[PDB]
């Protein structure tokens, strides 16, 4: 049988095996060197079109031969030597001189019109254009380049909901011309979003079908009912004809996906919100986190789509209000723009009001996002959560948002089934790891923080009672004996943050 | 009620 | 392999390649200059009719040679120079000139081609005649021309209800001769009007079928049950046979249509009421 | 017919047999020396291409002649001696030398062959890398090599739950290049985990399908209904196409598996927890016990994934606390790591606490293990148990963990000459490695710590206090009769030595 | 005994 390299050669040189070649010419020359059978030759000799005899010749060949010899020793004799020279060139720039393969025998045939074909057939989404986050898309392309050599690997492009990961992945497979063609031959991009236990099987059913030829999509059997070992075997079967194939698994929630990805020795890019799914894999795992949009980048994004830049001081302030509120978040920022109707800074501050007195539902809009509002997204992130973590999260409302505060200051509102409350930290960590709902910050002192988007989510969403109960449950422990953290001589008075507390009490008197 | 239908 | 010019030459000179020629005379000459093989030549040398040897010579020749040289440098020597002169003249009318014909007209009556055949088969409605809104139909045609280069794009012909959008779209694809033939190869005009959530998948089911060849409409399966990722893939599949294709989506209500349209990297004209 | 050498010659010299040759020149010479026939020769003489006459000459020639003589004695005479010299030289490099190539390497990059292709297609898991247990993986590979000659055999890679057996099997078939390619042609690695009685037939159904060609997986029938004798026969059928094939049976629970394996004369590696399933097999049975990770291997394992090694004394003690608690166990150690978040010794001791006051559920985490926590694993190991053994085990809570203690000292809590206790405690260590046998100084058993905190938060809250009482009772009954050192018989009367842990256990049940 | 084993 061959392998991924010799088949990468047979795959790269396919435009050519289509432009000048014929399997009838080779069947006779090949029954001799022992690489066929009279049914193999039966199947390939009587076929109406040539692309049929070719697809059967390259499939049967990729399975039957002990090596890629008796196919160099043929394009030669048949005056189609212009083929066997290309393939021997590739195998030589593969066994003897490595590295040189990407610059020399693979790149001089790139074409920005073949890419779009390959992207489209691999279901890659149409990269964003009016703004590109340089840094991230770049480091993705980089870390993908570093691994095309590797046999199987996970790249985790993880972030908040609406934090912009998938779009960045769309751009990373659309920016370079290297990743598809030079570093990897093909792309298969499949969206997961599986919650049920049958989802993790159906996905790889649609992988199996993302792989399969336009022929025998007709023949698809009642595979809906067929064991996992068989769908898996069917894939690693049909996966031979697929040398260096990249897999994007957009929006993974279940680590069972990742386990299949790791049993199937697949090459995977992965966008997800819960980062801990990587513990499922005992392997080369590499990570890229999509942080919240920095204050300057938000400017960049707005200018990028035609938004008028400030002059008066309370206009740059209006936009810092927006950037603060939507605590650096692509999606709600976009909804924000889409809903700014007249375009005035005025109606933008109108919305800035609307966000505090109606939550995300005040700016929910039709956006390139599948979601009307970021709350629909965070929804799932909150359902999946460990029941206890669901509790911790449910209580983190009654904090100050966009304020760095100690663990003990959290131990007061946060639940627990003695004298050391570190368990709070463990939960709040799980909480930031799994949808980036919190925010961990090791020194000066162990402190977490809840952002603003992630707060106004909870505001108009948690049980109206639990707010006032958390506020009182806070005012209890509250007594016993700026770019600066609140000191331990002064925890007894949270009154510093009275503003954002007078607001929840006014909220809970309605 | 502990979460207005999760959100 | 050859290409469009050289195969246009081997195709153009067939009325000629039948009156006087024989591939055996050339078989040795091609077995010689290393562009044939003694089985290839076997296949062409023992053939009952001359039309056999000719059809095999013209099929077989195109794979081995890097060009159409060792066939001009033969009709010369064989006293069949009236052939090699036509072909060298043509190769001169292509090697020596950066100008030929572009996508235009040299077999006239596109009146049954573009008007009758392609409009009707793409289900384009019978354009209005007794009044034409100049400005609007014109700007549609213009703005469609400017974008025919592009890989995928949305044109939203939006207005009030009964405001006349679809009719204008009917006219913009029925007036000119450019949009169909010059700028786009085919037209697919489909009415949406989908309100249910199952409508947006069924639509692209009937796209997928608007695409499928006259052969295998008989073979149409119980396709109603097959995933969306698969219907999408079957379309972008069957979309290989469709170079530069225009899509009219008459009467869109659901933005899910538009989302599929944008996942399927389609070229779309759209009449709709909601902007 | 020819053979492998002479056909290797007719195959090797094809690049050559195409540039200069013609079978008609030889047809008469073969019609003559009586090795052809005038229809054979008819078939080869009227053929349009030369490649035709050649492919027919090379197919047709191999049946009639006893050897490859009347084809060397021809390329000579025909001025095509450059052929017959190559072939006579080769025939000399085989007739005249008892040495050639053996099964080894001459077309390199078995890296995509043996590693990529055969492992992946045989469903072998992606071997672990960041730590390898030398001794064990090595002895697996060794003991597999010694047996590749044999027609059928069992290797039992048995141990505790989460003790690391399967991973070691993953590594033993992924390290070397010998086991796959040199010693065995193919690999079939299948997870069993069968508990129902229908599972043991379904398994070999998926063997049968692991075997079947890429062709005819489409043709897969409603095979679910066809007798066992027939599934067995279809396998030993489809097993013709499979010379020297290795079988990994990952996670066996039922000895019925092993019985089918022994009827089907298979070559089997086996990861399992219960060791007695081998009594099902009457055969060359060889065993490899996956012991608990020694304290030092635990260090290696810690260092391996980037964990900081101690300095102060009550930090090395903290980590010996962790290693003692998880009585040398790969999986719970790993869960421990995955859950050590900041990496500090501090949060490690946090966990050391959490483990005593919340059992194994305190460190349960997402891990390469199929199981959230080792308790989910031991679950099954406890379900399969003989009802009486389920009892004995259920009572063995009220002992001291990590202490070697006498049989009689056990006769007090365990249900029913009381040697019978020993028999139960034996069945009990053999079948999931739940106990721990130690023959002399005196026949004594022992319960480890992981195997304890399993039972703690698992046995009936009453039965703890009851076992504690039933012990203080028979202890004092024994009282009314009147370190590397075993507890003496002058002193069984006071288990009060272990009052510390006994006081804790007590607080658990009595509240 | 054994809360769900
Ligand atoms: N680089 C960008 N350019 C323009 N718009 C962007 C960009 N990144 C994000 N957006 C806007 O923000 C939205 C969220 O981006 P994206 O679809 O990548 O979310 P995501 O990271 O996949 O979140 P989830 O995992 O919850 O789906 C996009 O739909 C788009 O409207
Ligand atoms: N030149 C014309 N322009 C516009 N409307 C016309 C014209 N000639 C006739 N009409 C009448 O106006 C009617 C509405 O035209 P049309 O179907 O284009 O509306 P529409 O824009 O598609 O509205 P909707 O999307 O709500 O169906 C036609 O059915 C026809 O009766
Ligand atoms: N080198 C290693 N040796 C043993 N265990 C390891 C190693 N590296 C990681 N582990 C962890 O130990 C866990 C248990 O390993 P393994 O699956 O081999 O146990 P097992 O012997 O099969 O137990 P069971 O038969 O009960 O499943 C692995 O899932 C992994 O998380
Ligand atoms: Mg996503
Ligand atoms: Mg309309
Ligand atoms: Mg196992």
PDB file of C-alpha atoms in Angstrom, chain A residues 160-292:
ATOM      1  CA  UNK A 160     -15.356  34.073  24.554  1.00  0.00           C
ATOM      2  CA  UNK A 161     -18.666  33.810  22.717  1.00  0.00           C
ATOM      3  CA  UNK A 162     -18.768  36.231  19.808  1.00  0.00           C
ATOM      4  CA  UNK A 163     -15.074  36.805  20.559  1.00  0.00           C
ATOM      5  CA  UNK A 164     -14.333  36.330  16.849  1.00  0.00           C
ATOM      6  CA  UNK A 165     -12.497  32.998  16.564  1.00  0.00           C
ATOM      7  CA  UNK A 166     -14.205  31.370  13.613  1.00  0.00           C
ATOM      8  CA  UNK A 167     -13.965  34.416  11.435  1.00  0.00           C
ATOM      9  CA  UNK A 168     -10.226  34.568  12.201  1.00  0.00           C
ATOM     10  CA  UNK A 169      -9.955  30.924  11.167  1.00  0.00           C
ATOM     11  CA  UNK A 170     -11.846  31.768   7.980  1.00  0.00           C
ATOM     12  CA  UNK A 171      -9.203  34.401   7.284  1.00  0.00           C
ATOM     13  CA  UNK A 172      -6.250  32.228   8.290  1.00  0.00           C
ATOM     14  CA  UNK A 173      -7.159  29.680   5.620  1.00  0.00           C
ATOM     15  CA  UNK A 174      -7.833  32.505   3.177  1.00  0.00           C
ATOM     16  CA  UNK A 175      -4.908  34.856   3.776  1.00  0.00           C
ATOM     17  CA  UNK A 176      -1.775  32.889   2.835  1.00  0.00           C
ATOM     18  CA  UNK A 177      -1.538  30.866  -0.366  1.00  0.00           C
ATOM     19  CA  UNK A 178       0.685  28.339   1.400  1.00  0.00           C
ATOM     20  CA  UNK A 179      -1.609  26.567   3.893  1.00  0.00           C
ATOM     21  CA  UNK A 180      -3.767  25.026   1.178  1.00  0.00           C
ATOM     22  CA  UNK A 181      -1.599  23.543  -1.556  1.00  0.00           C
ATOM     23  CA  UNK A 182       1.883  24.121  -0.135  1.00  0.00           C
ATOM     24  CA  UNK A 183       1.587  22.972   3.507  1.00  0.00           C
ATOM     25  CA  UNK A 184      -1.661  20.998   3.265  1.00  0.00           C
ATOM     26  CA  UNK A 185      -3.287  19.512   0.174  1.00  0.00           C
ATOM     27  CA  UNK A 186      -6.927  19.809   1.190  1.00  0.00           C
ATOM     28  CA  UNK A 187      -9.345  21.400   3.654  1.00  0.00           C
ATOM     29  CA  UNK A 188     -12.405  19.930   5.378  1.00  0.00           C
ATOM     30  CA  UNK A 189     -14.244  22.490   7.499  1.00  0.00           C
ATOM     31  CA  UNK A 190     -17.166  21.165   9.545  1.00  0.00           C
ATOM     32  CA  UNK A 191     -19.208  22.914  12.237  1.00  0.00           C
ATOM     33  CA  UNK A 192     -19.888  20.809  15.335  1.00  0.00           C
ATOM     34  CA  UNK A 193     -22.068  22.485  17.987  1.00  0.00           C
ATOM     35  CA  UNK A 194     -23.004  19.029  19.205  1.00  0.00           C
ATOM     36  CA  UNK A 195     -24.757  18.692  22.543  1.00  0.00           C
ATOM     37  CA  UNK A 196     -26.556  15.379  22.193  1.00  0.00           C
ATOM     38  CA  UNK A 197     -24.501  12.163  22.449  1.00  0.00           C
ATOM     39  CA  UNK A 198     -25.433  11.171  18.878  1.00  0.00           C
ATOM     40  CA  UNK A 199     -23.984  14.430  17.547  1.00  0.00           C
ATOM     41  CA  UNK A 200     -20.380  13.293  17.912  1.00  0.00           C
ATOM     42  CA  UNK A 201     -21.117  10.362  15.594  1.00  0.00           C
ATOM     43  CA  UNK A 202     -23.218  12.268  13.053  1.00  0.00           C
ATOM     44  CA  UNK A 203     -20.443  14.794  12.712  1.00  0.00           C
ATOM     45  CA  UNK A 204     -17.878  12.223  11.643  1.00  0.00           C
ATOM     46  CA  UNK A 205     -20.567  10.748   9.393  1.00  0.00           C
ATOM     47  CA  UNK A 206     -20.506  14.053   7.610  1.00  0.00           C
ATOM     48  CA  UNK A 207     -16.733  14.022   7.702  1.00  0.00           C
ATOM     49  CA  UNK A 208     -16.789  10.611   5.982  1.00  0.00           C
ATOM     50  CA  UNK A 209     -19.112  12.267   3.426  1.00  0.00           C
ATOM     51  CA  UNK A 210     -17.090  15.490   3.137  1.00  0.00           C
ATOM     52  CA  UNK A 211     -14.306  13.194   2.046  1.00  0.00           C
ATOM     53  CA  UNK A 212     -16.173  10.996  -0.431  1.00  0.00           C
ATOM     54  CA  UNK A 213     -16.003  11.553  -4.186  1.00  0.00           C
ATOM     55  CA  UNK A 214     -18.818  13.195  -6.149  1.00  0.00           C
ATOM     56  CA  UNK A 215     -19.293   9.645  -7.390  1.00  0.00           C
ATOM     57  CA  UNK A 216     -20.781   7.420  -4.669  1.00  0.00           C
ATOM     58  CA  UNK A 217     -22.706  10.178  -2.959  1.00  0.00           C
ATOM     59  CA  UNK A 218     -25.509   8.390  -4.791  1.00  0.00           C
ATOM     60  CA  UNK A 219     -24.523   5.118  -3.140  1.00  0.00           C
ATOM     61  CA  UNK A 220     -24.589   6.503   0.435  1.00  0.00           C
ATOM     62  CA  UNK A 221     -25.997   3.523   2.440  1.00  0.00           C
ATOM     63  CA  UNK A 222     -28.189   3.579   5.531  1.00  0.00           C
ATOM     64  CA  UNK A 223     -25.008   4.505   7.409  1.00  0.00           C
ATOM     65  CA  UNK A 224     -27.160   6.359   9.982  1.00  0.00           C
ATOM     66  CA  UNK A 225     -27.299   2.928  11.627  1.00  0.00           C
ATOM     67  CA  UNK A 226     -23.805   1.413  11.651  1.00  0.00           C
ATOM     68  CA  UNK A 227     -21.323   1.028  14.500  1.00  0.00           C
ATOM     69  CA  UNK A 228     -18.780   3.629  15.584  1.00  0.00           C
ATOM     70  CA  UNK A 229     -15.892   1.265  14.886  1.00  0.00           C
ATOM     71  CA  UNK A 230     -17.180   1.024  11.322  1.00  0.00           C
ATOM     72  CA  UNK A 231     -17.767   4.726  10.642  1.00  0.00           C
ATOM     73  CA  UNK A 232     -14.230   5.186  12.054  1.00  0.00           C
ATOM     74  CA  UNK A 233     -12.757   2.395   9.949  1.00  0.00           C
ATOM     75  CA  UNK A 234     -14.687   3.696   6.902  1.00  0.00           C
ATOM     76  CA  UNK A 235     -13.015   7.041   7.460  1.00  0.00           C
ATOM     77  CA  UNK A 236      -9.431   5.849   7.928  1.00  0.00           C
ATOM     78  CA  UNK A 237     -10.222   3.794   4.829  1.00  0.00           C
ATOM     79  CA  UNK A 238     -11.460   6.649   2.677  1.00  0.00           C
ATOM     80  CA  UNK A 239      -8.698   8.738   4.318  1.00  0.00           C
ATOM     81  CA  UNK A 240      -5.919   7.107   2.334  1.00  0.00           C
ATOM     82  CA  UNK A 241      -6.858   9.060  -0.825  1.00  0.00           C
ATOM     83  CA  UNK A 242      -6.493  12.171   1.331  1.00  0.00           C
ATOM     84  CA  UNK A 243      -2.826  13.149   1.939  1.00  0.00           C
ATOM     85  CA  UNK A 244      -2.199  16.090   4.323  1.00  0.00           C
ATOM     86  CA  UNK A 245      -5.789  17.083   4.995  1.00  0.00           C
ATOM     87  CA  UNK A 246      -6.594  19.860   7.410  1.00  0.00           C
ATOM     88  CA  UNK A 247      -9.703  19.602   9.552  1.00  0.00           C
ATOM     89  CA  UNK A 248     -11.444  22.643  10.947  1.00  0.00           C
ATOM     90  CA  UNK A 249     -13.935  21.659  13.636  1.00  0.00           C
ATOM     91  CA  UNK A 250     -15.764  24.933  14.121  1.00  0.00           C
ATOM     92  CA  UNK A 251     -17.414  25.322  17.544  1.00  0.00           C
ATOM     93  CA  UNK A 252     -16.602  22.173  19.495  1.00  0.00           C
ATOM     94  CA  UNK A 253     -18.382  21.774  22.842  1.00  0.00           C
ATOM     95  CA  UNK A 254     -18.047  18.045  23.620  1.00  0.00           C
ATOM     96  CA  UNK A 255     -14.620  16.519  24.318  1.00  0.00           C
ATOM     97  CA  UNK A 256     -15.895  13.341  22.663  1.00  0.00           C
ATOM     98  CA  UNK A 257     -15.399  15.015  19.312  1.00  0.00           C
ATOM     99  CA  UNK A 258     -11.737  15.675  20.308  1.00  0.00           C
ATOM    100  CA  UNK A 259     -11.448  12.022  21.357  1.00  0.00           C
ATOM    101  CA  UNK A 260     -12.575  10.831  17.928  1.00  0.00           C
ATOM    102  CA  UNK A 261     -10.261  13.398  16.335  1.00  0.00           C
ATOM    103  CA  UNK A 262      -7.477  11.823  18.401  1.00  0.00           C
ATOM    104  CA  UNK A 263      -8.274   8.184  17.697  1.00  0.00           C
ATOM    105  CA  UNK A 264      -8.444   9.007  14.018  1.00  0.00           C
ATOM    106  CA  UNK A 265      -5.004  10.677  14.033  1.00  0.00           C
ATOM    107  CA  UNK A 266      -6.520  13.721  12.319  1.00  0.00           C
ATOM    108  CA  UNK A 267      -5.048  17.164  11.711  1.00  0.00           C
ATOM    109  CA  UNK A 268      -7.384  19.600  13.420  1.00  0.00           C
ATOM    110  CA  UNK A 269      -7.886  23.307  13.760  1.00  0.00           C
ATOM    111  CA  UNK A 270     -10.454  23.844  16.523  1.00  0.00           C
ATOM    112  CA  UNK A 271     -12.587  26.831  17.427  1.00  0.00           C
ATOM    113  CA  UNK A 272     -14.308  26.394  20.782  1.00  0.00           C
ATOM    114  CA  UNK A 273     -15.415  28.322  23.855  1.00  0.00           C
ATOM    115  CA  UNK A 274     -14.682  25.734  26.550  1.00  0.00           C
ATOM    116  CA  UNK A 275     -10.891  25.300  26.563  1.00  0.00           C
ATOM    117  CA  UNK A 276     -10.684  22.242  28.858  1.00  0.00           C
ATOM    118  CA  UNK A 277     -11.744  19.800  26.119  1.00  0.00           C
ATOM    119  CA  UNK A 278      -8.041  19.494  25.330  1.00  0.00           C
ATOM    120  CA  UNK A 279      -7.577  17.393  28.418  1.00  0.00           C
ATOM    121  CA  UNK A 280      -9.354  14.747  26.335  1.00  0.00           C
ATOM    122  CA  UNK A 281      -6.265  14.571  24.105  1.00  0.00           C
ATOM    123  CA  UNK A 282      -2.990  13.026  25.254  1.00  0.00           C
ATOM    124  CA  UNK A 283      -0.961  14.689  22.517  1.00  0.00           C
ATOM    125  CA  UNK A 284       0.636  17.657  20.776  1.00  0.00           C
ATOM    126  CA  UNK A 285      -1.787  20.365  21.847  1.00  0.00           C
ATOM    127  CA  UNK A 286      -1.138  23.986  20.938  1.00  0.00           C
ATOM    128  CA  UNK A 287      -3.282  26.976  21.757  1.00  0.00           C
ATOM    129  CA  UNK A 288      -4.268  30.442  20.521  1.00  0.00           C
ATOM    130  CA  UNK A 289      -6.617  32.512  22.654  1.00  0.00           C
ATOM    131  CA  UNK A 290      -8.838  35.166  21.071  1.00  0.00           C
ATOM    132  CA  UNK A 291      -8.815  37.856  23.760  1.00  0.00           C
ATOM    133  CA  UNK A 292     -11.301  40.698  24.035  1.00  0.00           C
TER     134      UNK A 292
END
